Paper text:
A major mechanism of carbapenem resistance involves production of carbapenemases, i.e. evolved β-lactamases that inactivate carbapenem antibiotics, which can be divided into two categories: serine-carbapenemases (e.g. Ambler class A KPC-2 and class D OXA-48 types) and metallo-carbapenemases (e.g. NDM and VIM types). With the aim of helping enable agents to overcome carbapenem resistance in Gram-negative pathogens, we analysed carbapenem-substrate derived complexes and identified benzoxaboroles with a C3 acrylic acid group as potential inhibitors. Crystallographic analyses validate the proposed mechanism of binding to carbapenemases, i.e. in a manner relating to their antibiotic substrates.
To investigate the structural basis of inhibition by the chiral benzoxaboroles, we obtained KPC-2:(S)-4a and OXA-48:(R)-4a complex structures by co-crystallisation (ESI†). The KPC-2: (S)-4a structure reveals a covalent bond between boron and Ser70, with hydrogen bonds between the inhibitor and β3 Thr237, α8 Ser130, β3 Thr235, and β3 Thr237 (ESI†). Crystallographic analyses revealed that active site of (S)-4a to KPC-2 and of (R)-4a to OXA-48 involves reaction with the nucleophilic serine. The results show both enantiomers of some of the chiral benzoxaborole derivatives manifest moderate, or potent, inhibition of the carbapenemase KPC-2, demonstrating their potential for inhibition of clinically relevant SBLs. In all cases, the (S)-configured compounds (4a, 4c, 4f, 4j, 4q) were more potent than the corresponding (R)-enantiomers, illustrating how chirality can confer selectivity in boron based SBL inhibitors. The KPC-2 stereoselectivity for the benzoxaborole derivatives is interesting since the penicillin substrates of some of the β-lactamases have a (2S) C-3 carbon adjacent to their C-2 carboxylate. The difference in results for the (R)- and (S)-benzoxaboroles may reflect different distances between their carboxylate and electrophilic boron; the analogous carboxylate to β-lactam distance is proposed to be important with respect to antibacterial activity. Addition of 4a, 4c or 4q at 100 μM substantially reduced the MEM MICs, i.e. by 16-128 fold for the KPC-2 producing E. coli strains; notably, the presence of 10 μM (R)-4a and (S)-4a decreased the MEM MICs to below 2 μg ml−1 for E. coli BAA-2340 and E. coli 11119. Based on these structures and computational results, it is proposed that the C-6 4-methoxyphenoxyl group of (S)-4q, which occupies a hydrophobic subpocket adjacent to OXA-48 active site, forms an additional hydrogen bond with Asn170 of KPC-2 (ESI†). This putative interaction may explain why 4q is more potent than 4a and suggests that further optimization of substituents particularly at C-6 should improve the potency of the series for carbapenemase inhibition.
Numbering used by the authors: 25 to 57, 59 to 252, 254 to 290
The structure:
Amino acid sequence: STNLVAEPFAKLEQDFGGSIGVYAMDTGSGATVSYRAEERFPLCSSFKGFLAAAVLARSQQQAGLLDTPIRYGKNALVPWSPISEKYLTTGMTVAELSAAAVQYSDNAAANLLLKELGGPAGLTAFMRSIGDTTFRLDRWELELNSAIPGDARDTSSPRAVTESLQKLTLGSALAAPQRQQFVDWLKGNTTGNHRIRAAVPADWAVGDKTGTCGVYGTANDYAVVWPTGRAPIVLAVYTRAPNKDDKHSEAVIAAAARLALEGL
Ligand SMILES: *[B@@]1([O])O[C](C(=[C])C([O])=O)C2=[C][C]=[C][C]=C21
């Protein structure tokens, strides 16, 4: 992955103060945009998108998985678990927990689903099973958010994120119904209006998954975007920064996404 007109990204990164990672592919032409696309960045909550895909893939071998209710306890409710909290008294099905993890970044949902898959190691093995040799999840919520510089736990690269997102939403990794379901959850995300969506023309359909670690200026977003009349674009925008107290920026993520889309 290289880029002979990277100066715009380099200037945005200098203005940001941290590091920016971008990979975008036009699945119609094959054109791509890269900037630190091979470098490792904390996933933060963005792993929750791939977790839901892994659940859908398991439902292809276990009938009734998605409809299975889970009557979880109050002490499943880790900070920022808005759907899980609201539905504590009733429980939630696996599909609802997947939906909640994708579209609200529900943390309790995320840990409950990880447990059904064998933990972080099971999600990682799923990702290996589709050809992602970069992704690694090592820890549960909320510990995976530590985002320590140079720590490779719970990281991937923007290119591997994009390539995996492509396989699961547009390729054959998932069966057709499972695939539409995964795209539908992403299209209903509520957390990403100031990130990639803020760079996408209002008349383009978008699904996305955000992540925010809360430390070290570390946040991200990845998305599938359908330009009018065309095959879709897939992209991933990740940030990090060298000081614990460096603030992340949603505007930086949106700007970097806009540079990628303009370059395509
Ligand atoms: B996680 O990374 O994602 C959300 C979040 C702020 C987002 O969607 O950008 C979140 C909240 C609380 C803990 C972890 C996460």
